[PDB]
Amino acid sequence: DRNTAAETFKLFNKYRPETAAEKKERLTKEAAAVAEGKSKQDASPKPYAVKYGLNHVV
Amino acid sequence: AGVKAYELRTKSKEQLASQLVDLKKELAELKVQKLSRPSLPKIKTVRKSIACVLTVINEQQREAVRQLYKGKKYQPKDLRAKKTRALRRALTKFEASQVTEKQRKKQIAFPQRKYAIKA
Amino acid sequence: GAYKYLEELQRKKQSDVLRFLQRVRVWEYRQKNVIHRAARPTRPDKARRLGYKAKQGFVIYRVRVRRGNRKRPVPKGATYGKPTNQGVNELKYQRSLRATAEERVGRRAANLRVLNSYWVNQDSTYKYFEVILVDPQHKAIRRDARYNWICDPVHKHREARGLTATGKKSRGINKGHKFNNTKAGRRKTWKRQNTLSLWRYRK
Amino acid sequence: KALKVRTSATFRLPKTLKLARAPKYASKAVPHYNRLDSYKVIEQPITSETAMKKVEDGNILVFQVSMKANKYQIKKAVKELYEVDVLKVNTLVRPNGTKKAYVRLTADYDALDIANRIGYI
Amino acid sequence: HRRQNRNQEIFDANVQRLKEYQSKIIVFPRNGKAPEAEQVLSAAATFP
RNA sequence: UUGACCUCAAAUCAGGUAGGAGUACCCGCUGAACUUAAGCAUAUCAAUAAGCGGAGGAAAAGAAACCAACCGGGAUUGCCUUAGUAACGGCGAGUGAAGCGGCAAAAGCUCAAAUUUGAAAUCUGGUACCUUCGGUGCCCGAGUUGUAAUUUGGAGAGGG
RNA sequence: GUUCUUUGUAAAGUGCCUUCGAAGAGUCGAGUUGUUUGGGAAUGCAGCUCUAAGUGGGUGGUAAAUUCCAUCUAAAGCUAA
Numbered sequence: 001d002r003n004t005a006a007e008t009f010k011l012f013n014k015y016r017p018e019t020a021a022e023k024k025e026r027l028t029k030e031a032a033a034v035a036e037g038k039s040k041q042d043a044s045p046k047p048y049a050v051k052y053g054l055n056h057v058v
Numbered sequence: 059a060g061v062k063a064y065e066l067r068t069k070s071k072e073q074l075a076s077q078l079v080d081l082k083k084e085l086a087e088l089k090v091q092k093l094s095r096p097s098l099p100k101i102k103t104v105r106k107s108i109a110c111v112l113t114v115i116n117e118q119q120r121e122a123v124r125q126l127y128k129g130k131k132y133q134p135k136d137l138r139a140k141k142t143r144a145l146r147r148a149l150t151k152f153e154a155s156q157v158t159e160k161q162r163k164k165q166i167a168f169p170q171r172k173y174a175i176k177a
Numbered sequence: 178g179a180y181k182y183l184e185e186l187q188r189k190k191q192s193d194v195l196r197f198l199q200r201v202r203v204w205e206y207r208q209k210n211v212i213h214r215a216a217r218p219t220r221p222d223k224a225r226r227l228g229y230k231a232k233q234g235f236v237i238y239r240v241r242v243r244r245g246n247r248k249r250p251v252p253k254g255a256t257y258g259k260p261t262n263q264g265v266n267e268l269k270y271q272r273s274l275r276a277t278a279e280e281r282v283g284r285r286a287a288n289l290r291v292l293n294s295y296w297v298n299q300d301s302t303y304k305y306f307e308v309i310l311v312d313p314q315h316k317a318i319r320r321d322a323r324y325n326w327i328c329d330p331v332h333k334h335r336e337a338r339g340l341t342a343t344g345k346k347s348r349g350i351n352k353g354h355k356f357n358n359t360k361a362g363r364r365k366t367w368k369r370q371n372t373l374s375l376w377r378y379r380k
Numbered sequence: 381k382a383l384k385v386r387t388s389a390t391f392r393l394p395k396t397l398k399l400a401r402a403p404k405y406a407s408k409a410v411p412h413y414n415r416l417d418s419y420k421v422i423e424q425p426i427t428s429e430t431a432m433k434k435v436e437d438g439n440i441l442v443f444q445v446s447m448k449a450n451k452y453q454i455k456k457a458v459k460e461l462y463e464v465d466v467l468k469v470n471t472l473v474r475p476n477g478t479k480k481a482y483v484r485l486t487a488d489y490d491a492l493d494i495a496n497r498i499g500y501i
Numbered sequence: 502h503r504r505q506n507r508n509q510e511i512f513d514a515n516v517q518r519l520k521e522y523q524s525k526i527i528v529f530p531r532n533g534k535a536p537e538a539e540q541v542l543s544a545a546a547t548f549p
Numbered sequence: 550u551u552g553a554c555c556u557c558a559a560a561u562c563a564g565g566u567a568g569g570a571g572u573a574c575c576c577g578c579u580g581a582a583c584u585u586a587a588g589c590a591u592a593u594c595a596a597u598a599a600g601c602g603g604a605g606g607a608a609a610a611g612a613a614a615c616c617a618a619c620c621g622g623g624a625u626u627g628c629c630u631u632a633g634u635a636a637c638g639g640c641g642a643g644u645g646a647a648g649c650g651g652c653a654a655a656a657g658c659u660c661a662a663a664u665u666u667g668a669a670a671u672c673u674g675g676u677a678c679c680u681u682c683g684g685u686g687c688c689c690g691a692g693u694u695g696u697a698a699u700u701u702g703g704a705g706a707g708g709g
Numbered sequence: 710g711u712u713c714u715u716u717g718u719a720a721a722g723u724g725c726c727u728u729c730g731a732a733g734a735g736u737c738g739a740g741u742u743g744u745u746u747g748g749g750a751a752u753g754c755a756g757c758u759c760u761a762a763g764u765g766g767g768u769g770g771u772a773a774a775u776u777c778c779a780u781c782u783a784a785a786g787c788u789a790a
C-alpha cells in the first residue's frame with residue numbers, strides 16, 4: 001500500500017549507506033585515530049545502514 | 059654549386075620563405091633561355107637548391123609543431139613513429155609485464171633459485 | 178550464495194515455471210533483428226562461469242541461427258558423380274549451429290573477440306544463442322592481466338579457426354583412445370601417419 | 381498520465397543537436413604549402429616558329445602551362461608575374477603530354493616588348 | 502601431482518633419492534656471494 | 550509539473566579497431582572425377598586436388614572425465630619400433646590405428662560455484678602536474694543483476 | 710660488480726584438533742538419419758525427438774540383465790622448447 005511503502009522507505013531514509021562524502025572524511029579521523037590512538041578500527045560508531053547485493057542478501 | 063645545407067639552417071623563417079621566390083623566379087628565367095641554345099647544365103645544380111630550401115623549411119616547421127605537443131598525449135599521427143601496423147597494435151611493455159595480485163604474491167614468496175652439485 | 182539457485186532452476190527447463198518464460202522470450206527475440214545488441218546477460222550464472230566478468234569492456238550479442246540440415250547447393254539436384262554421393266536433402270553439416278552463431282556475430286563486429294556462447298532459447302525454425310565477446314583494444318582489458326591473452330594477435334578470430342568450446346568439440350579434440358582420428362588435428366595426424374620418412378642411412 | 385497530441389499518423393526522429401568537432405590534435409600537423417602557386421602554373425614559354433608569328437600580330441603569348449591549372453588559374457598567375465591583364469585565355473592539351481595556352485593581353489600592351497624582356501624573341 | 506605410490510621399496514627408493522640429492526647440492530643464498538660452482542651438465546648422469 | 554530506472558537511437562561527438570596482400574608451412578568448412586577393381590554401381594583414388602573462412606614465426610595440442618589391470622604408468626608434440634600388425638573390405642581389389650618401450654624437449658596453471666558487508670577496498674575516462682612505453686591529485690561515469698583479496702580439487706575454507 | 714630507497718605493523722610458507730568443503734544442463738546420455746573411421750549390435754562429428762543424475766558421470770571399444778572392481782572428472786579458460 002501507499003502508506004506502507006511510505007512508512008517503509010521513511011525508515012530506510014534514517015539508515016543510509018555511506019557515500020564518498022563521508023567515506024573520505026572518516027579516513028582522516030581514522031588515520032588520525034591510527035596516528036594518535038592506533039585504534040583497531042573501533043573509533044567509529046557501529047554501522048546500522050541498509051545492505052545491498054542480490055548475492056549478499058540471499 | 060647552388061646553395062649549401064647548413065648555412066641556411068640559421069636563417070630565419072621569413073628569410074627562408076623569401077628565398078624560394080628568389081630561386082623560383084630564376085628557374086622561370088632558365089627555362090626561357092634553355093630553348094635558345096641546346097646546352098644548359100646549370101639548371102640541375104640549382105633545381106636541387108630549390109628542393110634543399112623546401113626541405114629545411116619542413117624540418118624547422120615540424121620542430122615547432124612537435125614542441126607544441128611535448129608533455130601532452132594525442133600528438134598528430136604522422137609525428138608518431140611509424141613502426142609497423144602489428145607493432146603499433148598489441149600490448150605495451152607495461153601492459154604485458156603487468157601481473158595479477160595472486161601470481162605476484164607467489165613470485166616474491168617462491169622465486170626460482172640457483173644451485174649446482176659439488177659433492 | 179545466490180548463483181547456485183539460478184543454475185539448478187535453469188536445469189529444470191521443462192518445469193511449468195520455465196515453460197512460461199521461454200514462450201515469452203522466443204516472441205521477444207523473434208520480433209528483433211537476427212543479430213543485435215544484448216544489453217544485459219539473460220543468464221548471469223552461465224556467463225559468469227564461462228569467463229564473462231560484469232565489468233567495463235564486455236558486450237553481449239543475441240543471434241538467431243536457422244534450424245535444420247545443410248542441403249547441397251548443387252543445381253536442380255544433379256551431383257555429376259558416382260551413384261554413391263547422389264544424396265542432397267539428407268546431409269547434416271559438420272559443425273553445430275553454435276559455431277555458426279559465433280561466425281555470424283564475430284564477423285559483424287571485427288573489433289571484438291569471441292569468448293564463448295550458450296543456448297538461451299529455440300523454436301521449430303531458429304536456435305537462439307547469446308555470445309559473450311571481449312574487446313582487446315579497450316584499456317580495461319589491456320590492463321587486468323587476468324585477460325591479457327585475448328589481446329595477443331594469435332587469438333585473432335578464435336571462432337573462425339574452431340578454437341572455442343564448441344570449436345574444440347565440433348572438430349573433436351580430446352584425450353583418449355575414443356579420439357584417435359582427431360587427437361592433434363585431423364589433417365596433421367593424417368599427414369604425420371600418411372607419409373614416407375626416408376633417412377640418410379637406409380636401415 | 382498525459383499524452384501529447386499528434387497531428388501526424390507517422391513517427392519521425394526529433395531533430396537533435398548536431399555536435400561540432402573538437403579534436404585533441406591537428407589533422408595533419410603543418411598544412412601543405414601551396415601545391416599550385418603562381419609559378420608552377422607557368423613553366424616554360426613555347427618558342428616554335430608558328431607560335432612566334434602569333435605574338436607579333438595577335439598579341440598572344442604561348443606557354444607550356446601545368447596540366448592541373450585552368451583558365452581561372454591561368455588568367456591570374458600570368459598577370460601577377462608580368463603585370464599585364466588578360467583579355468581572354470584559350471587552352472588546349474598538346475598530344476605530347478603537355479598543355480598549351482594562348483594568352484591574349486589587352487590592347488593597352490603589346491606582346492613584342494614583353495616577350496623579349498623575359499628573354500625569348 | 503597425479504600419481505600415487507603403493508610399494509614401500511619404491512617409496513623408500515624415492516625418499517632415499519631425495520635425501521642423498523639434497524646432501525650433494527648447495528643452494529646459493531639470496532643475499533650474495535655464492536661463487537661459481539662448476540655446473541654439471543646432467544643431473545641424472547650423476548645419480549644412476 | 551519535476552526528478553530518477555530500463556530499452557532504443559543522432560552526430561564530420563572524444564578515443565580506437567576490422568576489412569585488403571602473401572599463403573611455402575598451420576587451423577577448420579566444403580568437396581569431385583580420371584584412375585584401380587585386367588567390365589561395373591559398395592570400395593579404392595580420397596576423408597585428395599579445385600572452392601571458402603582464419604593466423605603466426607611457427608601454427609596446433611597441452612596439465613587427463615588419459616592409457617592400463619600391470620610390482621601400474623602419468624600434460625602435449627616429433628623420431629625408431631610396435632606394424633603391413635589388431636581391424637575394416639562385392640572379406641576382392643585394397644585400406645589399416647592405438648597402448649606399452651628407447652630418444653629429443655621438459656613447465657606449469659587459471660576462473661565460476663564461498664557475505665570483504667564494522668566498510669566497492671575495483672575499473673575506465675576527463676582535467677592538472679611530473680624524475681612522462683607511466684605515476685600522483687581532483688571530478689564526472691562503469692559497477693553490487695557485482696568489481697578487487699581470499700580457494701579450484703594436487704586441494705582448500707571457518708575457528709583453537 | 711657498484712649505487713639510492715627498505716617500500717612492512719604488509720604479504721607468503723610449515724605442525725596440531727574440530728566443523729565444512731560449494732566443482733560447469735538441452736548439457737551427459739538414448740533412439741534415428743547422414744558422413745567419417747580400422748572402430749567390427751555403432752570411432753568421431755552433425756541434424757531432429759526424448760533428456761537427466763548425484764558416494765553422481767564417463768571409460769574399461771562385440772549387444773543385454775544381475776552383482777562387484779579399477780580408473781579418472783567432462784559439458785569453462787591461458788601457456789615457451
